[PDB]
């Protein structure tokens, strides 16, 4: 049975960073590394398992996460580093065994006046535990005075929408990220 890789890579509409998408991969024979030849992905770094003998191995289980980041945050999708993307939106464990893929989507997720449909968390009260998703749009309490649900002085909205005009530098360009994690179980994925 072929794997539905086009349902994740070639999906019509894509998730934000604070609300990253998810897709479970099982019961298929998967053609890894044939994607490596395609020129769209500007990053195909893999950890623990070399990206060449992927086809010669089988894993009990595979996890796929799809989201959209900007520019100078592709280096943030990796183990062992800090920052607004890594500490508040998506954190990776130090003992990561999988791959990281990202490609440019200039003509899809960017418009001249700005595509404000992509969000990311910039406020948080604690760091992001490895492999955690934060969806709460509750107002962050920055000072001693309680926010009480009204956003104003020392009371700011936790999310900020990516500005994202195509006329800006590619350090702000769309970069659709696809993360695969590799873990009994049946034949699983091979």
């Amino acid at each position, epitope marked *: 049975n072929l794997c539905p890789f086009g349902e994740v890579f070639n999906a*019509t*509409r894509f*998730a934000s960073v604070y609300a990253w998408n998810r897709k479970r991969i099982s019961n298929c024979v998967a053609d890894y590394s044939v994607l490596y030849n395609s020129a769209s992905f500007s990053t195909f770094k893999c950890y623990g398992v070399s990206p060449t003998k992927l086809n010669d191995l089988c894993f009990t289980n595979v996890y796929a996460d799809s989201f959209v980041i900007r520019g100078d945050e592709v280096r943030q999708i990796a183990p062992g580093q800090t920052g607004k993307i890594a500490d508040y939106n998506y954190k990776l464990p130090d003992d990561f065994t999988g791959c990281v893929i990202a490609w440019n989507s200039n003509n899809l997720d960017s418009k001249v006046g700005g595509n404000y449909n992509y969000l990311y968390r910039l406020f948080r009260k604690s760091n992001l535990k490895p492999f955690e998703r934060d969806i709460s749009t509750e107002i962050y309490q920055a000072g001693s005075t309680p926010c009480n649900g009204v956003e104003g002085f020392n009371c700011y909205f936790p999310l900020q929408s990516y500005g994202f005009q195509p006329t800006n530098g590619v350090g702000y360009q769309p970069y659709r990220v696809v993360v695969l994690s590799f873990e*009994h179980a049946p034949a699983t994925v091979c």
Partner: antibody
Amino acid sequence: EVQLVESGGGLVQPGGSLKLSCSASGFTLSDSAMHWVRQASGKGLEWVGRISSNVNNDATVYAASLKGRFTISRDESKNMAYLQMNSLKNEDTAVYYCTVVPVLEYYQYGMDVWGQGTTVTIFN
Amino acid sequence: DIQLTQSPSTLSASVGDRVIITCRASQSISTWLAWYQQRPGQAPKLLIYKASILQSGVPPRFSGSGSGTDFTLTISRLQPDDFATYYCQQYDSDSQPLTFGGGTKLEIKR
């Protein structure tokens, strides 16, 4: 401070129609999948259906027993989820719960936010 | 379709005893199983997910295990607030229906 409020339940003649609304508060309902679960009086939990995220194009699956009578919809403008029911009969007299559980979508960690339930009663 | 059977339907125990609850499936579901608890007139709380991992905030006395078709919920130490009904649920695919268990009403012994 994440809540889930439902409404719309009431007396319904058999074979009529009713629409329920699960309103999300404190978070955007369009990002995560939404589950509908019902339970009759003194009976066990009965899974109704599920709507997916906006990213997954709002996929709908329903139980076999609810063949062609139930439809799940949502409204991103009002941050609410809908439950459509046709051809009502005594199996449907139950307390219906709206819940958002991100773990059943094969995630790792999440939160179990539930609603208060809306009693739907079918009378002749 | 997959039907879940909970055994037993009800049992009685005092405070501080170890209690086992079994949830058997028709077809092998791998590890997609969740456990719930429901107090009277109350919304169910999520307890165990993926059959082994604890939810944030529930006390450590709860423990779950199992794989394939046999699954177990264990309370190492019973307490007055844990005496309610429990349900098991399987995820097992994004395209086929999801099902609950028959329930296991846990009552006190006096």
